[PDB]
Design a protein around this motif. Structure first.
Motif, short mmCIF file in Angstrom:
data_model
loop_
_atom_site.label_atom_id
_atom_site.label_comp_id
_atom_site.label_asym_id
_atom_site.label_seq_id
_atom_site.Cartn_x
_atom_site.Cartn_y
_atom_site.Cartn_z
N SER A 51 -9.10 5.38 6.10
CA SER A 51 -8.59 4.99 4.79
C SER A 51 -9.14 5.89 3.69
O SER A 51 -8.50 6.05 2.64
CB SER A 51 -8.93 3.53 4.50
N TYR A 89 -3.91 3.87 10.92
CA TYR A 89 -3.94 2.51 10.39
C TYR A 89 -4.93 2.42 9.24
O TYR A 89 -5.95 3.11 9.22
CB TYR A 89 -4.34 1.51 11.49
N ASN A 90 -4.62 1.55 8.28
CA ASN A 90 -5.49 1.31 7.13
C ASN A 90 -5.44 -0.18 6.81
O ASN A 90 -4.54 -0.64 6.09
CB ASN A 90 -5.09 2.15 5.93
N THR A 91 -6.40 -0.93 7.34
CA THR A 91 -6.50 -2.37 7.12
C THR A 91 -7.79 -2.73 6.38
O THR A 91 -8.10 -3.92 6.22
CB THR A 91 -6.39 -3.10 8.47
N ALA A 92 -8.53 -1.73 5.90
CA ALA A 92 -9.80 -1.92 5.21
C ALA A 92 -10.92 -2.17 6.22
O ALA A 92 -11.00 -1.46 7.23
CB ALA A 92 -9.71 -3.07 4.20
N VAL A 152 -7.75 -3.66 14.45
CA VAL A 152 -6.30 -3.62 14.35
C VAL A 152 -5.73 -2.54 15.25
O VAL A 152 -4.71 -2.73 15.92
CB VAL A 152 -5.88 -3.42 12.88
N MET A 179 -11.03 -6.90 3.95
CA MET A 179 -10.79 -7.35 2.58
C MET A 179 -9.30 -7.51 2.34
O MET A 179 -8.49 -6.67 2.74
CB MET A 179 -11.39 -6.37 1.57
N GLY A 180 -8.93 -8.60 1.68
CA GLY A 180 -7.55 -8.96 1.47
C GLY A 180 -7.06 -10.08 2.37
O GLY A 180 -6.00 -10.65 2.10
N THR A 182 -6.93 -9.97 6.05
CA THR A 182 -6.46 -9.60 7.38
C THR A 182 -7.64 -9.72 8.35
O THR A 182 -8.49 -8.83 8.41
CB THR A 182 -5.88 -8.20 7.39
#
Ligand SMILES: CC(C)(COP(=O)(O)OP(=O)(O)OC[C@H]1O[C@@H](n2cnc3c(N)ncnc32)[C@H](O)[C@@H]1OP(=O)(O)O)[C@@H](O)C(=O)NCCC(=O)NCCSC(=O)CC(=O)O
Lengths: 146, 618, 146, 34
Positions: B123, B168-171, B177, B405-406, B408
């Motif tokens: 990310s 992928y970028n899920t924090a 993920v 964060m967020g 997920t």
């Protein structure tokens, strides 16, 4: 007879004759009777070949080395009157591998059943500290963010 | 011209994590990470590796890798211009991916052309601004070396993979993920392997200031499960793992029982607030879909960010989902109190610790857990127990969480691989360990490690699976003898061009007392001599007697010399063939032509030995 | 104010698409829906960071690429895998593949696959020119002069 | 307090694209693009 095997009993110009096709009793008789053209057989060898002298001792080490040249690697699998020949054999093959011949040293022992036991150490650490890191590349600098 | 369709069929077998590698703070490799974890060594230090300890008021302590200025550009086929205009994260990740591939017993040739998917999770894109502040021509190559989509693709391009390569970028929960995606693609049949991984390096102090303004960071190191916890400390990781079908894996650290993901939704406490219900539901779903008895979990790798709002909710979810019915305390832990918070590489950190716990079979200690958090009732009711010291994990299931964060969330379960080693007939006899590397010092270290494990044959097999790489990739070829009476070690630089392996067979005069006597230690050599002596016995020749107790007077005769020399030549040929050496050419002196015929396939052991017997008889 | 315009337009477009499908805020609330936004452009960060001041910390929740699907999950109250993808020019279909993968196993019943891309930096176009990616005139698909 | 597990079962039916929206160059909506 495959082309890999270089006959040292029939002259080069007679390799195409029918007698030089099979290693039948005629071939054995001719080899036992006719002369041995060792030098001619060693001329077809490339200039940087890795010749392995398979024999109870390195008998033809000097002869082969002179015949081949300077750029050809030479190794003997055995040494006469050696206190230990197994180490000599392993060292010879280690030299052969170091010069770029593939092989499987584990083929002399029963094959290991995969997957291996969980007690096997990690190989990642060895490769991590075995890189060529002479050159230093650009990295972001603090002064570039202001 | 027509192309054969691939057999895309659902897969129902097991998935095993085979390799692991990565750079961790104050740890150049996995071994250093393991040593630091098991010695209660704090990997968050204070220095000026990135910026001054206090620059712009950012926290002094951080988790930083040893170096990010090193890369073997020539090995990966990247020119100087591309390597210079290339993210250090991607460089370190490429090195780590290769190390992980080698660790799992795989090699460049074996993994080339396979249906492998790459699922890098990255990310951070801070190197774009610095490189663009003073942009000049020749910097265009950043598109192919700086874009986030180029992290997995380069891995696909270099290793020649032909499977889904996605970024992928899920924090903070991106690594798990990617693991979920790999499990999804593996089970559908598109791929047979996966290179799930992710890297995260800190470059911009203003980013740290931005995180501070949101109260994300704390004062001291991550105080996981500690009442004084007030935030986390940023860390750096470049780890990656290799997954393969359990049936085709040459090394199995563990098995991936299953992983899944979920979201929190519209929570009234803000988007940046953990949802205990969501995590609990995710845990319940994962332990129910796979019918896994949640009471069987031995160790729990928690997402211990150390905040006052994250740890209590995560512990409550764990207590409600996995501690229901447990008759003993459930050992929880985290890898954030040791090296801090890796941001987009926290899940890979947890995977690394889990693969280390299940490989060393010991739970690494948890640091800075002095006083239990009063808001975590599980620590006082006996349901939860932070592993503050090395605990002997015997076997079972280990669970990992990654709450990004967020909202997920992500959960995964791994089953330990219990295949404790059994003695091999080798490991007490001399062996020839052959390998290749990029530098002489690296190969010397490799040989030192091999000598350290001279009693392990499985380790030798794993090394050998990748010891036949072409000289182009690893020009430094070397060999050493383990369990040797006399030390031997050779290292040479072999050009890219491949030389010819020619067999030369000697003739008469190689005779001597004890010829081949030592080589009887090898099983194949003795077997070949026995299978030739049995052939020659009916003709009045006891080959074993002439070769073992034969004397000079015996060898003065005509028969025994010819018989013994041929026997040695044929036995050595069998030794070479078993080892896997194919001769490009064969030449021989008189009396060696029979050996040449045998090695060339034109003759047989019976034919060659009897030919020599007939020669000397005549 | 400290939010990417791409995220704002995407949120509006996602709501419009939801309404278009005959769905509504109350009907999709609490459903097992996954969000698979594909975004790669991050030029909004450098501009906002060139003159960073206090109160700009909210960019983390309005600027990070991971917040594109997450916000959609948060606003519409979805409880399914919300992930951001970056596969270059073919990210939008990779998101579709992920949605198909997740739908055929049972985690979700709906998907919000999408994608946004806005051009802000005038230097990125220069980067693409240096590689000969861009042409002179409009895309001449299947044209000899392309 | 106990949470009912979700029935995560493979789906074998059809997948339908139901809604579409977006901003396109010189088009404020799908209709203008069309
Ligand atoms: C002259 C040679 C014998 C080798 O003598 P050199 O001393 O000059 O060679 P060198 O110094 O480099 O190394 C000699 C190596 O061989 C060993 N060696 C030398 N002489 C030996 C002898 N009489 N008996 C046993 N071993 C001997 C040494 O221990 C040494 O081992 P190390 O070096 O490992 O320490 C060789 O050049 C040769 O091939 N000569 C002709 C033999 C021949 O071709 N006959 C053809 C038909 S006989 C046949 O095949 C049977 C048949 O025709 O049916």
């Amino acid at each position: 007879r495959s082309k890999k095997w270089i006959s040292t009993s029939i002259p080069e110009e007679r390799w195409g004759n029918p007698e030089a096709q099979t290693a039948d009793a005629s071939y054995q008789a001719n080899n036992l009777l006719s002369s041995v053209l060792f030098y001619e057989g060693l001329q077809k060898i490339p200039s940087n070949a890795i010749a392995i002298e398979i024999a109870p001792a390195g008998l033809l080490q000097s002869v082969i080395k002179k015949s081949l040249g300077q750029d050809c690697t030479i190794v003997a699998l055995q040494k006469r009157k050696s206190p230990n020949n197994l180490e000599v054999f392993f060292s010879a093959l280690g030299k052969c591998y170091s010069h770029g011949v593939p092989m499987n040293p584990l083929g002399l022992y029963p094959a290991v059943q995969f997957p291996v036991s969980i007690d096997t150490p990690m190989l990642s650490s060895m490769v991590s500290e075995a890189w060529d890191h002479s050159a230093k590349w650009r990295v972001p600098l603090v002064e570039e963010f202001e | 011209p027509p192309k054969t369709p691939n057999v895309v069929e659902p897969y129902k077998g097991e998935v095993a994590i085979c390799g692991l590698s990565g750079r961790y703070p104050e740890s150049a490799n996995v071994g250093e990470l393991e040593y630091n974890l098991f010695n209660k060594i704090d990997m968050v230090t204070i220095d000026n590796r990135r910026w001054e300890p206090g620059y712009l008021g950012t926290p002094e302590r951080m988790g930083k890798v040893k170096t990010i200025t090193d890369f073997d550009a020539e090995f990966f086929g990247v020119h100087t211009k591309g390597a210079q205009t290339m993210d250090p994260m991607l460089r370190n990740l490429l090195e780590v991916v290769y190390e992980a591939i080698v660790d799992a017993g795989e090699s460049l040739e074996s993994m080339k052309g396979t249906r492998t998917g790459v699922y890098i999770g990255v990310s951070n894109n801070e190197v774009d601004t610095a490189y663009m502040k003073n942009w000049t021509d020749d910097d265009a190559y950043m598109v192919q070396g700086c874009h986030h989509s180029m992290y997995p693709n380069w891995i696909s391009f270099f290793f020649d993979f032909s499977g889904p390569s996605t970024a992928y970028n899920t924090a903070c929960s991106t690594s798990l993920v990617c693991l979920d995606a790999a499990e999804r693609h593996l089970r559908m049949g598109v791929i047979d392997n996966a290179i799930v991984g992710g890297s995260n390096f800190i470059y911009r102090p203003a980013t740290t200031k931005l995180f501070m303004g949101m109260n994300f960071l704390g004062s001291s190191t991550c105080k996981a499960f500690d009442e004084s916890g007030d935030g986390f400390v940023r860390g750096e990781v470049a780890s990656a793992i290799l997954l393969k079908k359990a049936d085709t894996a040459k090394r199995v650290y563990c098995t991936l029982v299953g992983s899944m993901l979920n979201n929190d939704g519209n929570q009234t406490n803000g988007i940046l607030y953990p949802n205990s219900e969501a995590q609990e539901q995710l845990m319940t779903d994962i332990y129910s879909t796979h019918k896994i008895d949640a009471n069987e979990v031995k160790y729990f790798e928690c997402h211990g960010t150390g905040t006052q709002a994250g740890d209590p909710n995560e512990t409550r979810a764990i207590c409600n989902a996995v501690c229901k019915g447990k008759k003993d305390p459930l050992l929880i832990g985290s890898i954030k109190s040791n090296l801090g918070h890796g941001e987009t590489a926290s899940g890979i950190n947890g995977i690394s610790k889990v693969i280390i716990t299940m490989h060393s079979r010991q739970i690494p200690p948890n640091l800075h857990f002095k006083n239990p958090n009063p808001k975590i009732p599980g620590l006082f009711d006996g349901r939860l127990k932070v592993v503050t010291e090395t605990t002997p994990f015997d076997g079972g299931l280990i669970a990992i969480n990654s709450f990004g964060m967020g909202g997920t969330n992500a959960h995964a379960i791994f089953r330990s691989f219990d295949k404790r080693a059994e003695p091999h007939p080798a490991s007490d006899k001399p062996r020839l360990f052959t390998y290749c590397a990029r530098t002489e010092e690296g190969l010397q270290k490799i040989f030192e490690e091999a000598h350290k494990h001279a009693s392990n044959v499985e380790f030798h097999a794993l090394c050998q699976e990748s010891a036949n790489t072409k000289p182009k990739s690893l020009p430094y070829r070397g060999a050493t003898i383990l369990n040797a009476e006399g030390e031997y070690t050779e290292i040479q630089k072999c050009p890219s061009k491949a030389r010819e392996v020619w067999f030369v067979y000697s003739g008469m005069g190689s005779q001597w007392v004890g010829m081949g006597r030592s080589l009887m230690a090898l099983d194949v050599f003795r077997q070949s001599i026995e299978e030739t002596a049995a052939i020659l016995s009916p003709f009045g020749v006891d080959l074993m007697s002439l070769l073992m107790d034969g004397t000079e007077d015996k060898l003065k005769e005509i028969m025994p010399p010819f018989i013994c020399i041929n026997a040695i030549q044929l036995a050595l040929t069998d030794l070479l063939n078993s080892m896997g050496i194919v001769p490009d050419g064969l030449v021989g002196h008189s009396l060696g032509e029979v050996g040449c015929a045998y090695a060339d396939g034109c003759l047989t052991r019976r034919e060659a030995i009897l030919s020599a017997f007939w020669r000397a008889k005549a």
